[PDB]
Amino acid sequence: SYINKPGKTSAWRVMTVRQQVSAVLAYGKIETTLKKAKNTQKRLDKLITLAKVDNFNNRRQVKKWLLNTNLFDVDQLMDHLFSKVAPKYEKTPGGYSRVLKLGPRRGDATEMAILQLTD
Amino acid sequence: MKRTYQPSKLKRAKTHGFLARMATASGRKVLKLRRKKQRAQLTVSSE
Amino acid sequence: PIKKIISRSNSGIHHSTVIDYKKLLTTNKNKPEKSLLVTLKKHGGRNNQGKITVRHQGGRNKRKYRIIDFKRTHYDNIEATVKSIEYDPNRSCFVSLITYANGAKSYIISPDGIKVGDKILASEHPIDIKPGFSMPLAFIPEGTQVHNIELHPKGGGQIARSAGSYARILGQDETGKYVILQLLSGETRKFLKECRATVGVVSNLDHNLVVIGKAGRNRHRGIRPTVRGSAMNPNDHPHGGGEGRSPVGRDAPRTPWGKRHMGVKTRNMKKASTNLIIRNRKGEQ
Amino acid sequence: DVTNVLLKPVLTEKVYFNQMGETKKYVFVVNPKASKTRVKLAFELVYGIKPLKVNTLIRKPTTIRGGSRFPGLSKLEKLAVITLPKGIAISV
RNA sequence: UGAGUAACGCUUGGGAGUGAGAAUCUCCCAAACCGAUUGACUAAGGUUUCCUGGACCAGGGUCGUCCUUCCAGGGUUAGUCUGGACCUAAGCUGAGGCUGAAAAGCGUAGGCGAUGGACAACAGGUUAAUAUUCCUGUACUUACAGUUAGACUGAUGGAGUGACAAAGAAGGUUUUCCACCCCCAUAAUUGGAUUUGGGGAUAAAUCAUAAGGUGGUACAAUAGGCAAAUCCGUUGUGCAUAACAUUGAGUGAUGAUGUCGAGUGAAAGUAGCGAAGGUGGUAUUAAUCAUGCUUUCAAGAAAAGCUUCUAGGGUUAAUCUAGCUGUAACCAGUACCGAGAACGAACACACGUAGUCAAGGAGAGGAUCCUAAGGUUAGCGAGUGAACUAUAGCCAAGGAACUCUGCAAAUUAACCCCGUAAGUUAGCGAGAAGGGGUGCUUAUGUAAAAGUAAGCCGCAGUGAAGAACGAGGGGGGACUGUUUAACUAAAACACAACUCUAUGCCAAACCGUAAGGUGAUGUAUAUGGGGUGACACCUGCCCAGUGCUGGAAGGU
RNA sequence: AUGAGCAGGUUGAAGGUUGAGUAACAUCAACUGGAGGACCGAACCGACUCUCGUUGAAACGAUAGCGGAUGACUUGUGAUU
Ligand SMILES: [Mg+2]
Ligand SMILES: [Mg+2]
Ligand SMILES: [Mg+2]
Ligand SMILES: [Mg+2]
Ligand SMILES: [Mg+2]
Ligand SMILES: [Mg+2]
Ligand SMILES: [Mg+2]
Ligand SMILES: [Mg+2]
Ligand SMILES: [Mg+2]
């Protein structure tokens, strides 16, 4: 075999991470594969802890990751985050999200998991 | 690549059609043979 | 005369030439008169069966036959006048568009020397000897250049009408009829004294000196590649085969078919015209 | 005039949707060997109303019953719509 | 058995919903690729594959509630579109006829045969499926009858037109474009905004105008045009420089109190509602005039059709032209795909398939990169990131030591500016070789810009993407070309040129038994054939043998 | 036989005009003109090399290069051997 799919390039990986963390911020829960949630959790935690200052520089840094969602566009998602999500986590040192495991899918037996965040 | 059957219904009709096969004696002979074998699609004229 | 063509296209070098077509023709624009044009259907070397009978002949351009009056019969003792001298693609020579007094246009083969406004005539009585005139051979004096000759009386000028051809009168025979002619390429014939002709050599005398430079020009002129025998395979030619640059093997060179080719007489001796021949470019009869 | 060129009228939702206009474009299926002039003449003889315009189309036979171990062919039929003057209507 | 092994034949994430079952179905939001195309219109080709509702046995390289699969119902509307009822090209067929054991072959008059010619309709709206066809608005064409006015009409035949190559350049004309202006929404919590974003249109047709283009013109004689011609052709006369005839892009008005229209928007982004809908220039763009013009030679369809001519007719009239009233306008195709899933490849196969539309930025460009209009989720996934394989990326020092060979890979690459040798058929060599500059800002630049000066930054300034690596000597073929589809593209073949040979026309040669046909509607400055293969210089000896031509006595 | 196609950008022949020159030629300089089986190079055509593939995606192909690209050119439709 010589021609092949573009596959899981670094850009694809980081863009999937961006999409998933944006969705988590929008809704608060995701049903994705466990070995993707276990990676998304790092950027999720970093974004949550970075947004506890609300200076323009932190919002600029957050702009580098978010992507607009059906529920919230990017700017409204920023306002939502910095207005009600970050204040809820002003005293918890790290560990803002939990990743619990579901049952396998009938399609591929992949081990879906829930990336969820709460106090 | 370019295969060996590029269709054109006009060429098919003029070459293997009924009236083309009724033009020469050999065409009549082969029509007689095909009637003998009782082939339903007697010529290419019928689809 | 010829005008050399300097290509200066830096892909090989060709010293091509072409007839001037400017100081010899008139109204160099390609504007023939409509009424005597019929299109030639290019047979393409093939035959009514569709097979190839003559090799390497095809690909010529599309021409339009200029209806040329060879018989020169329907118009007698009626004066004409040359109107122009165009280039006829069909044949090597030049065609003049003449206009008889009544007003019936026609094409003839232009003798060399004539210009626009000249006056020519064709009849059966002894008339002048100026170029372009036409009269039976019995009345022409000996020695004058003659073309457009025909074999059978009232037949049309089959013989010696190519570019720059002619024929010398050589008096009459001892039988009184069958005036003797010195045809080109050494052959001397005998023609009945009631045959017509036209005095003066044919124009476009420098068609022989042309030098076709490019292969494409020749192909556009209607000629196709000719494959030699030694390139062929042992099938399809007697000279084929051989393991590399083999010389001709048999006793004598062969045609593509089995016929012997070199230096072999091939004319049919049992033709009535044999009595009309005096010499055949080599010797008697 | 034999009236063997008016096989049947067809009632489809498109036909009705055309009926709730004002021209009342009646439609029929006709003998495939007939022509528009014959169709309109027959319509005149059978109802008494001279039509305004006639348009025709023919449905080519197609494979029917799909793969059912005995596939057949459909029917070749010609449809002839028959427009009328704006202020008139008739039954069928 | 191989074996539950290779393989599953170019890509995602999430929310909501249905459902028993959800990665694979629907909706939503992103995302990624295509975007001189996976975008839109179609020819041929396929023949219902199109739309709606239902099903998930079988087919879908997995799943399935879903499918181009299956079941049920439905869908293509033409006086103007494509073809026929009109015309012919190559060619086919062919009454008689010619030829041939028979079948049959050739061919005349006729008749067919588009890939071409002539021929009257445009914009918008409408459905789930059709739309120059249906609907609204506006028109046009041809027949037929009556009526009115005028006029003598003129073919089956004659004449003119129809009617044509390639390349190239300039010009008129609107367009593109730019600038101004008009209209609509927009005023922004992240530091600073006093803007940003979008739009600015209309057809066929009728009337007037029309830059230009084409080409002597009128009169008088006619011995030619199967027959007659006032027509054409021919010949003279005066006028000639523009007159006449012919044609002509565009412009103006009506068409249009309409439709469309950025948006706004109820029951859906849908019904509805819906503003402006312009000025000037242009040293850029396309399209028309144009079947125009110039040049060159390899000298560039036919017929129908149109105008005209007399023939023939009409005269106690026909026929034609024009208007008005009225009637008629036939047959077949019209769906869909048109291709990385409906066609040709046995396939939901990386392959092939005519034409047309062809946006922005930098750009000469349809090159390249990212995108616009628009479209898609490449019909198995998820993990790990071992050996090993492929495709990329890079590698210090050395720079062909590799090797059968610098194969492969690597360097240069765009534009502008200096500079370019030997040799030569004086055309070339040659983008020879070898070097320099490009970024941004200000100023100066002119009509725009190149250009120039000053200054600033970085390691680097066609910062990415797309661009020739040369030098020297030799063999071969003169060169551009063609060749073994699917192992050999060359020194092979061809080629322009040379020579010899044959052939005087019912030509030689060739296909066929023969008619017949090519040669050729050509005539030795031509044609067929063998050999060499530009160009420059040469082509020596031998006719004993073989081949050929000639020979006239003798022998057989 | 009948149609169609060749994005774009270079080179600047013959011929002609002007002036010089010539007793007249020849010849020289400037302008015009736009030729080439000319050049560079997309669509298009072709297959010279490496790799991959060889029960392949494919009964001859893919990425990368490569040659021609106004003509001995390419191609659609129709006919014929
Ligand atoms: Mg497995
Ligand atoms: Mg095993
Ligand atoms: Mg294994
Ligand atoms: Mg596997
Ligand atoms: Mg394809
Ligand atoms: Mg195509
Ligand atoms: Mg573009
Ligand atoms: Mg591209
Ligand atoms: Mg040789």
Residue numbers in the entry:
A (entry chain m): 2 to 120
B (entry chain 0): 1 to 47
C (entry chain a): 2 to 286
D (entry chain s): 2 to 93
Give sentences copied directly from the paper behind this entry.
To investigate the structural details of the translation machinery, we first obtained 3.5-Å consensus maps by averaging all ribosomes detected in cryo-electron tomograms of intact M. pneumoniae cells (Supplementary Discussion and Methods). Focused refinements on the 30S and 50S subunits improved the map quality and revealed well-resolved ribosomal RNA (rRNA) bases and ribosomal protein amino acid side chains. The high-resolution in-cell consensus maps allowed us to build de novo an atomic model for the M. pneumoniae ribosome. The structure shows high similarity to other bacterial ribosomes, but also reveals several new features. Specifically, 11 of the 52 ribosomal proteins in M. pneumoniae have extended sequences compared to E. coli. Most of these extensions are predicted to be disordered, but those of ribosomal proteins S6, L22 and L29 form secondary structures and were built in the model. We found such extensions to be common throughout the bacterial kingdom (Supplementary Discussion and Supplementary Table 2), possibly representing ribosome diversity in adaptation to different environments and lifestyles.
Translation of genetic information through messenger RNAs (mRNAs) into proteins is performed by the ribosome, one of the primordial macromolecular machines in cells. The ribosome consists of a small and a large subunit (30S and 50S in prokaryotes), which form the aminoacyl (A), peptidyl (P) and exit (E) transfer RNA (tRNA) binding sites at their interface. During the elongation phase, the ribosome undergoes a fundamental cycle to add one amino acid to the nascent peptide chain, which can be subdivided into three steps: decoding, peptidyl transfer and translocation. Here, we use these technical advances to perform large-scale structure classification and spatial analysis of ribosomes, to visualize parts of the translation process in great detail inside M. pneumoniae as a prokaryotic minimal cell model.
